[PDB]
């Protein structure tokens, strides 16, 4: 979230080194590799994520407004922020 993508990669890899079982961690390194512009390791991670996701789906088959408003409000703040960034990018 801070865009300190090197430090993001460092702790996501430490998370895999400690618990390699969660695909949200795997997907997160894939997104960080995409942001770091590393398409070869990104493609390998995507293939592993997709095959293990197929395995999770197969295994699982064989085996609020008060909060929602703040999600929406955050999105509206992000829209306004990026629109004023666009107003600067136009110049």
Swiss-Prot record:
UniProt-reported outcome of changing residue 86 to V: In strain: SK1
Effect of residue 28 to I: RNA polymerase III defective
Maturation and modification: Phosphorylated.
First and last residues of every TPR repeat: 1-22, 23-56
Subcellular location, record wording: Nucleus
Further remark: Present with 876 molecules/cell in log phase SD medium.
Subunit structure, as described in the record: Component of the TFIIIC complex composed of TFC1, TFC3, TFC4, TFC6, TFC7 and TFC8. The subunits are organized in two globular domains, tauA and tauB, connected by a proteolysis-sensitive and flexible linker. Interacts with TFC1, TFC3, TFC6, TFIIIB subunits BRF1 and BDP1, and with RNA polymerase III subunit RPC10.
Protein function: TFIIIC mediates tRNA and 5S RNA gene activation by binding to intragenic promoter elements. Upstream of the transcription start site, TFIIIC assembles the initiation complex TFIIIB-TFIIIC-tDNA, which is sufficient for RNA polymerase III recruitment and function. Part of the tauA domain of TFIIIC that binds boxA DNA promoter sites of tRNA and similar genes. TFC4 is the TFIIIB-assembling subunit of TFIIIC and essential for viability.
Protein name: Transcription factor tau 131 kDa subunit
Gene: TFC4
């Amino acid at each position: 979230e801070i865009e300190s993508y090197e430090t993001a990669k460092e702790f996501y890899e430490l998370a895999i080194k400690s618990e390699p079982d969660d695909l949200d961690i795997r997907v997160s390194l894939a997104e960080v590799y995409y942001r770091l512009n590393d398409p070869e390791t990104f493609k390998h991670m995507l293939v592993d994520v997709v095959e293990m996701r197929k395995h999770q789906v197969d295994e699982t088959l064989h085996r609020a407004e008060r909060e929602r408003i703040e999600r929406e409000r955050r999105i509206t703040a992000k829209v306004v922020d990026k629109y004023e960034k666009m107003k600067k990018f136009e110049l």
